[PDB]
């Protein structure tokens, strides 16, 4: 399905190697929340995407933190892949759909 | 796939629209006008699945769209405008958002 | 989104533009063809993909805010109106006709 991969990296990831299915490719540098909530808001508005991949190449654990208030707030899935956003939190909630690894 | 709808009128009117073509229940369906005189315009749209209903600022307050999942039928009310109507089905492969599949058209006047 | 195309009424014994008030490397315009009584067609999707089971002489480029639309060989098909729809923000919108003769 549709289905958004962001990745905020410094490690040089490029992105041309990233019934109804399509993939959303993205490279990202800064890691500031309301940098996350405008892109959230703007890609949210691109044709119904409902599959979030992000993960973070900082050691900041609020980003997790927000990523999960936002799923809940959206009622949309996000995963935990690199990173402080990956880190496993203490108690999610069923109200969130927000998931990691 | 083939649609079919209503007749004419000439208050409040009711148009339906029914699906004999595929599995009513996947795929979304929009309303467009086409007033004589420009292109056409865009009312919104109603996924028979969930029921999840959008609707144009524009249009908004004017317009009821309701489904009904037993009979596959598609229902847009307008309350308290004499223009041509169509209701149509996107290909399905997305993204696109393009409208293939047109229907016969319903003319009201007041 | 507001779309402007010129002119409403084309002499051809021929193009057609249609600018605009794209997606991550991606064009967001599809041109319809509508003979009098029928029910429009998709000619062109992503503003520089034609359509599977067309005419090759059907062509088309364009980016930003300006796009252009032109044909040849010239032959009786291309009779009818013509418009532009963009799909970055919702709802769509259509052009305001373009004949021909």
């Known amino acids: 399905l549709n289905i958004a991969v962001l990745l905020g990296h410094s490690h040089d990831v490029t992105e041309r190697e990233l019934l109804d299915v399509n993939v959303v490719a993205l490279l990202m540098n800064r890691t500031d929340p309301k940098s996350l909530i405008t892109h959230v808001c703007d890609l949210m508005s691109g044709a119904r995407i409902h599959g979030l991949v992000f993960g973070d190449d900082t050691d900041q654990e609020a980003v997790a933190q927000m990523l999960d208030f936002i799923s809940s707030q959206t009622f949309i899935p996000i995963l935990g892949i690199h990173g402080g956003a990956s880190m496993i939190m203490a108690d999610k909630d069923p109200t969130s759909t927000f998931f990691q690894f | 796939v083939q649609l079919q709808q209503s007749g004419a009128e000439l208050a409040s009117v009711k148009i339906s629209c029914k699906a004999t073509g595929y599995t009513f229940r996947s795929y979304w369906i929009e309303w467009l006008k086409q007033r004589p005189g420009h292109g056409l315009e865009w009312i919104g749209e109603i996924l028979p699945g969930s029921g999840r209903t959008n609707y144009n600022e524009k249009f908004k307050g004017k317009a009821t769209i309701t489904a009904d999942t037993s009979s596959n039928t598609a229902y847009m009310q307008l309350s308290s405008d004499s223009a041509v109507y169509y209701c149509?089905?996107?290909?399905?492969?997305?993204?696109?958002?393009?409208?293939?599949?047109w229907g016969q058209g319903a003319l009201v006047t007041v | 989104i507001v779309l402007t195309q010129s002119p409403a009424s084309l002499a051809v014994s021929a193009t057609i533009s249609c600018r605009a008030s794209?997606?991550?490397?991606?064009?967001?315009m599809q041109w319809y063809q509508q003979k009098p009584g029928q029910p429009p067609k998709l000619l062109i999707y992503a503003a520089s993909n034609v359509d599977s089971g067309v005419p090759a002489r059907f062509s088309g480029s364009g980016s930003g805010t300006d796009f252009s639309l032109n044909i040849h060989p010239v032959e009786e098909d291309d009779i009818a109106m013509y418009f532009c729809?963009?799909?970055?923000?919702?709802?769509?919108?259509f052009g305001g006709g373009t004949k021909l003769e």
């Open positions: 729809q963009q799909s970055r923000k919702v709802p769509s919108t």
């Open positions: 149509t089905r996107s290909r399905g492969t997305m993204i696109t958002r393009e409208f293939t599949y």
């Open positions: 794209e997606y991550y490397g991606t064009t967001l």
